[PDB]
């Protein structure tokens, strides 16, 4: 006998069915489902429990899918891809509720607003950070940068948009000012992903310099906003936009890694305590199940791994 | 003892070398010369493994039958636990395991009838600066007309049997003159 | 608490359990080629998947130019491998 920690059927699961290189994956906030996609363009939905069967698959994308996030109420999935389009999928219907189309170059990264009106922040290789609204064809805000943007998030109040890119430094725009209120400086190479903390106080940002840097985005900080740096993961010559994600308890942080290992760090000490093998290629995305200590990781090896951990 | 200096294996007694005497100490033949047959060895039950001969040349198979505990009659009217027939999960897990291996074999067997490798080379001379290589494998395209490449009716004697199992009989019943 | 090296791991150890190094001396008998991790007769062979197009790029740079971006996992500071004077220049 051995210790168990989740309702998974086995302490790790191997999900097979993809043929494309899986570039993104996220859980539904209700914990019932996860959705995963990448170069196959098909978005695969999986149940979290039991046989974890691939109950649904959505086509419709025709350029590979960079990033994919659920809306907070789990009514819709927002996903974006290199077809220069942001597509919002109704979870009950499995159909494209909105197809935002004003980007001029590949859209790589997406983040829905947490509450209030449903807004979708997006960042692209045209250098624009754009916030779309479900109710209008035209976007609400377009913030233009000289250099391509490949990561985006709102803050928790959904009134500051944080975008990172080729600049390494970060264009953080405040939606009442339409100005950069501050920049976060420490990244020596491009920013492959940004994820907002559950409470919204912090963001982690992952970069091709092989570090994750934790930033305090609260309105007042008396000094430098850099809280800490995490290392151990690696970015290879593929230059992927390796993502990052928070644990819902905030005590743990994850990032994609080219060395096949699933990294977990302790937020305060920045030490590693989980280094989980099993992948055969670049782990492009990693996420925590929102209610249960299940780790999701999606890799360039065409495989999705579910596994349970002792989150302490 | 630090006024004394050892000089031969007598000087140590039954103890090992002395780390406080900074001289080259050889309490036995150990380390004097230079570094193919099993050693005589004790078992965990305190006897001595003369039977260990019978375990050379096997895959660590069940046939430890070389003591005598395993030829004398073990208990009658047994305490039923291990002696119960295994559960439904066991016959299911066993049956599924058996087919799934032979199935993958049979598909290649009727055929007989991108993908990459990451290679980490212990030879540290390496490619330039790289503790590993990553390498692309492709399969040579089989020409569908080309007839079998090689003569394969080559015949050689049967491979030697696996090393003998101990013979384990009861003592000979002598029946000499009349029978 | 530790978990030994196994063809597959069933049960997700943390990190102190898997990684913590084997204690004690190391042989003088068998030095720098022989000590390394291996599985086949010379090497650790494991399957891999990559972004074909980028892997194709890295051949062509080493062949034409003399240098490449380092394939290894955990490459550390050795990001590039080749005629480093050309890589920096």
């Amino acid at each position: 006998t051995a210790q168990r920690f989740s309702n998974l059927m086995a302490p790790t699961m191997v999900l097979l069915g993809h043929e494309g290189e899986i570039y993104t994956g996220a859980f539904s906030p209700d914990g019932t489902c996860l959705a995963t996609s990448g170069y196959d363009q098909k978005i695969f939905f999986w149940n979290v429990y039991g046989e974890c069967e691939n109950f649904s698959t959505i086509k419709g994308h025709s350029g590979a899918v960079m990033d994919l996030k659920f809306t907070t109420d789990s009514s819709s999935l927002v996903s974006c891809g290199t077809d220069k389009s942001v597509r919002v999928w109704d979870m009950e219907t499995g159909t494209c509720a909105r197809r935002f189309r004003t980007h001029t170059d590949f859209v790589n990264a997406v983040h829905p607003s947490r509450r209030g009106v449903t807004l979708v922040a997006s960042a692209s290789d045209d250098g624009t950070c754009r916030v779309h609204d479900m109710r209008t064809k035209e976007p609400v805000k377009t913030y233009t940068n000289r250099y391509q943007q490949t990561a985006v998030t709102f803050n928790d109040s959904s009134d500051q948009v944080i975008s990172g890119g080729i600049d390494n430094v970060l264009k953080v725009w405040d939606m009442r000012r339409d100005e950069i209120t501050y920049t976060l400086t420490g990244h020596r190479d491009t920013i492959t992903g940004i994820s907002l903390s559950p409470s919204g106080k912090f963001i982690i940002s992952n970069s091709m310099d092989c570090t994750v840097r934790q930033w305090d985005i609260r309105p007042f900080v008396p000094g430098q906003r850099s809280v800490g740096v995490f290392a151990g993961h690696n970015h290879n010559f593929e230059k992927n936009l390796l993502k990052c994600s928070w644990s819902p308890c905030e005590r743990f942080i994850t990032a994609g890694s080219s060395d096949r290992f699933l990294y977990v760090w302790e937020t305060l000490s920045k030490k590693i305590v989980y280094k989980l093998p099993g992948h055969m290629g670049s782990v492009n995305c990693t996420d925590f199940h929102p209610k249960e200590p299940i780790m999701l990781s999606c890799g360039s090896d065409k495989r999705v791994f579910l596994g349970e951990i002792d989150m302490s | 003892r630090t006024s004394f200096r050892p000089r031969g294996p007598e000087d140590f007694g039954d103890g090992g070398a002395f780390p406080e005497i900074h001289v080259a100490q050889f309490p036995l033949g150990l380390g004097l010369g230079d570094m193919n047959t099993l050693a005589l060895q004790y078992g965990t039950d305190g006897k001595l493994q003369h039977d260990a001969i019978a375990r050379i040349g096997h895959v660590k198979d069940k046939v430890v039958y070389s003591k005598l505990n395993d030829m004398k009659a073990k208990t009658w009217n047994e305490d039923d636990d291990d002696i119960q027939k295994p559960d439904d999960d066991a016959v299911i897990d066993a049956t599924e395991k058996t087919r799934m291996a032979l199935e993958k074999i049979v598909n290649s067997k009727v055929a007989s009838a991108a993908q990459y490798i990451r290679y980490t080379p212990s030879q540290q001379n390496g490619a330039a600066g790289s503790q590993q290589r990553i390498i692309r494998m492709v399969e040579e395209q089989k020409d569908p007309m080309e007839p079998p490449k090689f003569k394969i009716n080559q015949k050689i004697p049967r491979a030697p049997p696996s090393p003998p199992a101990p013979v384990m009989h009861s003592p000979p019943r002598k029946m000499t003159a009349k029978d | 608490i530790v978990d030994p090296k196994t063809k597959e791991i069933k049960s997700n150890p943390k990190f102190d359990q898997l990684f913590k190094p084997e204690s004690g001396p190391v042989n003088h008998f068998k030095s720098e080629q022989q000590r390394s991790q291996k599985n086949t007769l010379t090497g650790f062979v494991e399957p891999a998947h990559l972004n074909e197009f980028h892997f194709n790029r890295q051949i062509r740079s080493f062949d034409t130019l003399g240098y490449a971006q380092n394939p290894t996992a955990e490459s550390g500071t050795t990001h590039f491998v080749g005629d480093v004077k050309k890589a920096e220049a």
């Binding site: 096949r260 596994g307 | - | 996992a73």
Partner: peptide, 11 residues
């Protein structure tokens, strides 16, 4: 299907 995590090589 359920599975397990194959341990890769290290430097």
């Amino acid at each position: 299907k359920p599975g397990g995590r194959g341990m890769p090589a290290m430097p």
